[PDB]
Amino acid sequence: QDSLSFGFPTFPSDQKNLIFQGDAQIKNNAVQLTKTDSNGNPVASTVGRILFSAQVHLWEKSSSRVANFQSQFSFSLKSPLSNGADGIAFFIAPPDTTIPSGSGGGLLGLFAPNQVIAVEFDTFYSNTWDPNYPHIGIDVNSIRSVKTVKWDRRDGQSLNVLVTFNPSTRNLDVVATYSDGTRYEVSYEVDVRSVLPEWVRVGFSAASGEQYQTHTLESWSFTSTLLY
Amino acid sequence: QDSLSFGFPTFPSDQKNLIFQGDAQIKNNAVQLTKTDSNGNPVASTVGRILFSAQVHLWEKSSSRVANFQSQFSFSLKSPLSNGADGIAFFIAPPDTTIPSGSGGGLLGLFAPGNQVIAVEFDTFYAQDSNTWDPNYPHIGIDVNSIRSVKTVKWDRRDGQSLNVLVTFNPSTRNLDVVATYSDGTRYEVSYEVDVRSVLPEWVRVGFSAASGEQYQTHTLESWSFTSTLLYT
Numbered sequence A: 001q002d003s004l005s006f007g008f009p010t011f012p013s014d015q016k017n018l019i020f021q022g023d024a025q026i027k028n029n030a031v032q033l034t035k036t037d038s039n040g041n042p043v044a045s046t047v048g049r050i051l052f053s054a055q056v057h058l059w060e061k062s063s064s065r066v067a068n069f070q071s072q073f074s075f076s077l078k079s080p081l082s083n084g085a086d087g088i089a090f091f092i093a094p095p096d097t098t099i100p101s102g103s104g105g106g107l108l109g110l111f112a113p114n115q116v117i118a119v120e121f122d123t124f125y126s127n128t129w130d131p132n133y134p135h136i137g138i139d140v141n142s143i144r145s146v147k148t149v150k151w152d153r154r155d156g157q158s159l160n161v162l163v164t165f166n167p168s169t170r171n172l173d174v175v176a177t178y179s180d181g182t183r184y185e186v187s188y189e190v191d192v193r194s195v196l197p198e199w200v201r202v203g204f205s206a207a208s209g210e211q212y213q214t215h216t217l218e219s220w221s222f223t224s225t226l227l228y
Numbered sequence B: 001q002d003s004l005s006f007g008f009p010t011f012p013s014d015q016k017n018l019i020f021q022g023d024a025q026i027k028n029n030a031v032q033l034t035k036t037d038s039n040g041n042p043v044a045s046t047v048g049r050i051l052f053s054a055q056v057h058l059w060e061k062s063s064s065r066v067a068n069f070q071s072q073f074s075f076s077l078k079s080p081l082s083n084g085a086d087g088i089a090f091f092i093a094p095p096d097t098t099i100p101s102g103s104g105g106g107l108l109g110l111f112a113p114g115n116q117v118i119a120v121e122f123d124t125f126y127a128q129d130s131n132t133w134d135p136n137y138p139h140i141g142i143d144v145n146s147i148r149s150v151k152t153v154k155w156d157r158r159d160g161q162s163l164n165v166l167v168t169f170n171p172s173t174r175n176l177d178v179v180a181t182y183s184d185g186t187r188y189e190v191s192y193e194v195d196v197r198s199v200l201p202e203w204v205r206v207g208f209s210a211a212s213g214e215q216y217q218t219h220t221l222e223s224w225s226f227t228s229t230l231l232y233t
């Protein structure tokens, strides 16, 4: 399809179109990307990702078209620790993408110690950002944090995020906000054609090594349409 | 998702989200449900079906919600003969739906000879035992589970001509409306009240099916756009 969209106001346990990878699973009508015990507490050494089953036609060579797509989602991170790690990421990658071997910890289950475009929200502190505070980073292929912005982790607080891509400017924009209005934005130019195949899959990934926290994907809506 | 949308203005050969069944495949930027030869011509004894890969959340009991959905598509039937058969159909069925063994010919690859589903079939074949339509002429029929053509409207077969069809379901009225029109404006419409909750599981797959027995014709799906959204009710 030239255009595709879907919306998950919530994530009930009877999912049919989510490709669950690693420890990702539904709990409390939300996607717990990372493992939680029988009490819902985040645990160490965990990775998890989800992918919408329908592939997205990000761009088409034959027609010289690229997709204009938007990805809105909310998540929250909770941890008994004052330093929960490592982060959650929205990503776009080849359809057969799987969690790379040894991609835990700060690798968010996205990078091996490819092709992808990711917007990651890292909490646990490598210089492309200020190691002191957490950060939002955009990743293109094997280049993590090609562009970033200081971010504030807020345990238990939801962060609504809007990731948009305009093919006429090739501007990948990211706007994240908390319920009180606190905003964070980072954008970067990226020709999706030069880093991703025509057909791709979108989803989220998250991980925790020794430091942990839940990576709860509360909602998610997506839309893509090929434009000349 | 409570909402799913997708549109195919055309069907280029590099598809990913379509589940091809039977002889269904892509040729000349369109879906040929029934087999065609090297010359694009139809051949007898063939059945083909396509389903969108993602399942649609048609209705949900826990929230007492039913999906409002619309399905727009275009097809054209072409045959060197004059008794082109048997027909094409848009249908909704359980996710694991597959061609019922022996569902060829007038069974459109949808029903078994001698389910749960809603379908809107566009028939061009003749049935001597027709009870819901005039057998002497083709017909657009709405199917609900085991009842084929619970409602129908006379229709005309125009070789090679595209029929633009819009199938919509309003959970509030439970009206399943079908409006078909050829490029010259010739319009056909048939609607039937149906509570999808009583005939289909919460999750389903949408798609098309077609077949040809001794008589044949092409069942070319040229475009298709679909939308579905859950709401209280």
Ligand SMILES: CC(=O)N[C@H]1[C@H](O[C@H]2[C@@H](O)[C@H](O)[C@@H](CO)O[C@@H]2O)O[C@H](CO)[C@@H](O)[C@@H]1O
Residues within 6 Å of the ligand: A044, A045, A046, A085, A086, A102, A103, A104, A105, A106, A107, A113, A124, A125, A208, A209, A210, A211, A212
């Ligand atoms: C337990 C685990 O999965 N460790 C992976 C590791 O986690 C490390 C480190 O990467 C993280 O920065 C922090 C934050 O908590 O946790 C641990 O210290 O990354 C390795 C590669 O970099 C993986 O091979 C490990 O599996």
Ligand SMILES: CC(=O)N[C@H]1[C@H](O[C@H]2[C@@H](O)[C@H](O)[C@@H](CO)O[C@@H]2O)O[C@H](CO)[C@@H](O)[C@@H]1O
Residues within 6 Å of the ligand: B044, B045, B046, B085, B086, B101, B102, B103, B104, B105, B106, B107, B112, B113, B125, B126, B212, B213, B214, B215, B216
């Ligand atoms: C030849 C063939 O495929 N027959 C299938 C059968 O076909 C019939 C009938 O359905 C058609 O209306 C006409 C015109 O195409 O041809 C034959 O008379 O349906 C059977 C199951 O109902 C299949 O098993 C046959 O393969």
